[model samples]
Structures are given as C-alpha cells and as structure tokens.
Target: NPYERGPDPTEDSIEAIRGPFSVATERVSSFASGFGGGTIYYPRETDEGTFGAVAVAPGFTASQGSMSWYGERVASQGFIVFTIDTNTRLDQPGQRGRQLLAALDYLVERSDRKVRERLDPNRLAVMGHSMGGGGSLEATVMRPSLKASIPLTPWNLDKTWGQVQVPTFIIGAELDTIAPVRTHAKPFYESLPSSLPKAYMELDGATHFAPNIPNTTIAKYVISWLKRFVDEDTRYSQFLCPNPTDRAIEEYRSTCPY
Candidate 1:
C-alpha cells in the first residue's frame, strides 16, 4: 500500500532547527505534473543567500512520507529541501523523468521573486533512492536545472547518461541486493562521460538502506560530499576528488574463482 509509512517527520526535524533557523512547508506545481504537486521546506528570516536545495523522487511503491528521513537530513544542513511524491493518480502514476521534472520546475519557479524567492538556482542538487535513483539519473540528462546530482544506489536503465553536463556523485554499497553491482553501479559509472567530474564511493557492508538512515558514518560521508559539492567548502575534496584507489573500507582480496 502507498500509505504504509507513518507521518513524515516534523518541520523541526527536517530543517534541523538547532539554533537560529526556522522551517515551513507549502505546495508547488509545474505543468509537467498537472496538479501542482508536493511540499517545499525553506529556512526563515533569511536574506537571499546561496541556498542549496535537494529534490527527491521516491522508489516505486513508496509513500511520499518515506522521503522525510533523507529530506530532513539534507534540510538540516542549510539547504531547502523538496520531496515530490511520484505516486499520483490514475492519469499520473509515478514515471521517473516526469515526476523529477515537475519538482525541478517548481524549484526554478520558486526561486523567482514573483514566486517564493527562497533558493539560489545555481546551487541546486538532485538525489533519489532505489528506483528513484534511476529517475534521478534520467533527470540529469533530461533537465538543465540541476547544478549537481547524487544518486544513492540508483537503478539507471537509460543509455544516454554519459551526455549529462553537470557533476554527479554515484554512491553505492558493496552488499546491495536489489540494485546489484552488475545491473546498476558498475554499468552506470562505465557509461558516464570519461572526462566529467564524477566520483563513485561504495561503502563496505552497507545495504541499500544504509545511506538513508540516521547514523554517524552515513552523516559524515554525506556531509563531506555536500560540503564539497553544494557549499564549495572543498575540505574533503581530497578524499572524493583526485580519485584515490585505496579508500575502500576494507579490501576483500581478489582471488580467481575460476
């Protein structure tokens, strides 16, 4: 059922309102979605700052509320977060690209003063989980609104992903079963443009759900990536960029099974 997950986390949890920030939500729509889709969360009492935003597409059969876990984490880090529900109605079952495009359109429109004026369009990023990961990849090639992308253990089926223009970070787990290495992680990386600024990190002993939950290690790696990509902090740029080969958590020595 689409309503399995409980109520989404509260605004305080999503925005990580620890100090001076405030959070609120509202509905936004793009013609692409036809019905003016899901919710948007923004920081309060803020001047027009260089804001980072994340648009999420949930996996197949997911309730929109399921996104709160990851969305709140992203919002807590000083970025406006939008989690668009793809599970629409009879006319609008959640197709990958269209749902993402609708969410992207809403963000661009909201950035305008005539609309909402909450985000810097230049610093936007898109991320997704499971099947939505495949959709996020499609969003990369199909839309120009996104400045950076992070597809967490995606399930890309499209062939033209190499043509994407912006930077992308593909994170996967060594122990994923649903989107196994052969079908997703390895193939997607191999297909990407050879000269593009991209990075792939595989967490040892992690499952498909590893990065989405509230844990310290996941927070550390994700924050490091976000700092480098969204905030341009560059502190952890050395770990992800210049592409090291020895960072694998623990090596399973290669042996010929043949």
Candidate 2:
C-alpha cells in the first residue's frame, strides 16, 4: 500500500521549487487539556479544500520555541503545524507521544472556528527531535492512522519499532553525541519493517540541534515527504525520489520502490 500513490517525479528541479502558500502563526493554549501548550502555524489561506496537519514535539529539556521553525516552514507549505511543549520537559517518550495526539485532538475540535475549517482532521503527521522524535514514532505506532512521521535524531532507550506502519522519514545527524546515530537513529530506522515505506537520512556534520532550526536542505526534504505522505499529494514525488545527492547528506536509504 505504500509508494503506490503515483509515478516518481524527477529530482532535477525539486530544490528550486517552493510552495505557494502564505503562512501565519497563532498562540494556542492546551495546558488545560493536559497537553501543555504551544503555537500553531498555518497557511493564511488555501485554494485547496482543506490542508493536512502535523503535530511536533520538542526534545527532552527543550521547549516548543526550540522547534517552532519546523511549524512555520511546514505551515508555509500548506499544512497546519502545531509545535507543542509537554506537560513537563522531563516527560518520557510515551508521555510526549500522548501529548502530541492530544494536541491533534484539540486541533480537530477547534476546526470549526479556531482552525477556521482550514485543517483536515483525517490527514495528519507527527514529527519531533531527539526524545521528541522517539515520541513521534511512538505516536505513529500508537495511532496507525497517521499519514506520515519524521523522527529527527531521535533518542529512545527502547530499541523496538517493528510495529510502526506509518510512512516514516528518519533523519539523523552524524555528529550528534547526545543521540548518537549508531545507537538511537540507526537502530530505530533498521527496526522498522521492510514492508513499510521508510527512509533514513544522515546529515554529514550536523549536531543534535541541527534539525531544531530552519535549514534550506532539511526544509526541502521535510516538505516533500510531508506533501507526499501526509497530504497524499503526488506532485511532491520529484523531491522525494531518486534520493538526495546533496553534499550535506552523508548517507541515505529508503524502501521507495520507484
């Protein structure tokens, strides 16, 4: 069922392409609901009927501010993105995962007015960095209906992920000492079932926090993968297929049959 969406688009001009949506950000409160709270970024307007959604969790000891760049950039590309803080910075991966889902539920409940019907409740994705990244994977495994997931330099003491069925893009930093690629990222990627569509990208010289901020190269791939999987938009195939040859990429692997 994975990679059956459409023909692979050529990667020749993907880097040069940019999404057409304009973006805006708003502060949202979910602390009362037990999800802690953060900000939501969304397109100012969309010609499409409804846009997909993404919920992001920050790493351990980190706040939503550390990861708001992803929400802004992803929202600019036509998805409603929520960058959230956990109930507590020390919350474990499972707790973070639950909080991420709670944020999604809050979004859906607010779709009628606050979200202004701009977000599609059915189309969703989860993403995070370090411990948050592990939480993102845990969220996908707990809620298989998630259209996609992106775990950046994830850190989880638990090494099992064979049950994750969501299309996943696992990003790792070669220079990350906190969540070493050899122990955390690589094993998580390898643990996923071969039957699912998945990819592992190791940044050449990036550190643990490299993915927390906005980088053009990381934005390109993250936007493309979300569009392809979460939005179910085949138009993004060009950016995702053929694997990136960019010098910043130290290694790449995928189950994309194209």
Candidate 3:
C-alpha cells in the first residue's frame, strides 16, 4: 500500500516503537454562545517538546471526522493537531473561527507543565475545508495570533482576505467550479495584503474534493505548503513561495461551470 501512498506509518508502524498517540475529544464554548466538539490528536511523549499545531474546520454538513484524515497525516509529521466541528446542528453556518480559537485554547491549557507541556502555542496554524475554508479566512480577520492559514476552496463573501495579517496559502482546483478559481481563489489571493507572504495554487486535473482526500498528489502539495511555513522550512519552497506567473494548475471533472 506504500505504492498507493498508503496507510500511515506513524499510526500503524512507528506507534508501537514510539508508543501510541493520544486522542481526546472535548467541547469548548464558542462566541455564538454555543459549544463545539473537537478532537485533539497528540503523540504520547510529553518530553517530545512543543510541536506545531493545526486547527481544521470541515466543510458544510461534514463532521469533525471529515477532516481527521489530514490531522492524522500531520500528526505523523510531529504535530499536535485538532479537528473541530464547526456546524452547531448541521444546517447553520460553520463556526470555524470560534472552534479554531477553542482549539488554541486547548493548546494553551495543555502547554502547562502540570498538564501536557509539549505544545508550542507560538507555532500555530489554522486550516479548513469548503465552507470551513471561508471560516478559516474569517478567522484570519479575527485572530492575528494565527501564523498561517490554509483555506481549501474557500468562499468569502464578506471580503475577509483584506484583513488577514498572517501568511496564507490559497489552494484550489482548475476544474473546481464549485468554488471556482475566479470567485474563490483569484479574488481572495489578490485581496490579501501584499506585504505578507501568500501563495495561490490551482492544481490541474484536480477537483474541489480531491485535494482534501488523503494520498492524492494534491494532498502532498497541500501538506508541503503547510510544512514550509508552519515548520519554518523552505524544503517545499516551490509551494510556500510560489512563482506568481507559473501556477500549479491541473485538470479534472468540473464541479461547476465558470
């Protein structure tokens, strides 16, 4: 299955050697006077030092489990990741920013030496899928504490990009008309404050759903982008500091007509 970019090594292999990872689920209060459930996935070793953190918001109607795939992938890379459920009851707008903040709060509590002292709250990053993408963007406007944001196929009707202060990676699909490059990717990318680092990518042959699905080439690129800035490494410089003129465009089934 390694040939298929298969089963996670950290979860299946190294876990026995390194000890099993710990995942705890809890609810946190949101600004909307509501509570949201979130799962925190962490390596068992407290002496491992404070690793990075990622807060994820799944797409509309999707639960915390929907984004757990990426969380596992990142957890393999030595991070304490949290996937939060933004939907209060499935039909309401996603509470991504609130849930994201709640995840940060968890890290703060865990960082205490008496509790779990392995989290580096300073190296925080946020990400989301679909409507959660827009929610992540909205979080950018609300929290300058975020060092980076990865918004997948986001839809920001409120023009929140203008207020973003952290570095961001705007990833989309050339064939994804659901949240087309023009409406979602291009406009948001252009509106981002030019001073901060930003990259806009439209993967060719990929759809809105493909990138988030584990083991895809697109997922590799997405993970690469996050590692570059989140880990403060340029090994994936092509994705982190992309060439504006030469994009990562791909072709795939059309989710919508643009």
lDDT by candidate, in order shown? 0.59, 0.82, 0.61
For residues 111-159, could you state the per-residue lDDT of candidate 3 as single tens digits? 3342246566677888887778877787777788787788887765655
TM-scores of all models? 0.73, 0.91, 0.74
lDDT of 1 at 8: 32
Show model 1 residue runs off by greater than 4 Å: 1-22, 27-36, 45-50, 88-94, 110-115, 235-239, 242-258
**Lowest summed lDDT window (length 10), candidate 3:** 1-10
Each prediction's RMSD to truth: 9.2, 3.3, 7.9
Check candidate 2 and list the clashing pairs: none
Clashing pairs in 3: 50-118, 203-250, 204-249, 204-250, 204-251, 205-250, 205-251, 205-252
Candidate that would win on lDDT: 2
lDDT of 1 by residue, 1-258 (tens): 211111233323322323234566665544334323666776564553546677776666664566666555555555677777774522222265567766766677743352257666666677777677777777777776566677777775553477776567777778989787557866776677767666676777778776556544444445445555666654445445444344444222111110
Instruction: Order the numbered candidates by lDDT, best leading.
Output: 2, 3, 1
TM-score of 3: 0.74
Question: What's the ranking of the predictions by TM-score, best on top?
Answer: 2, 3, 1
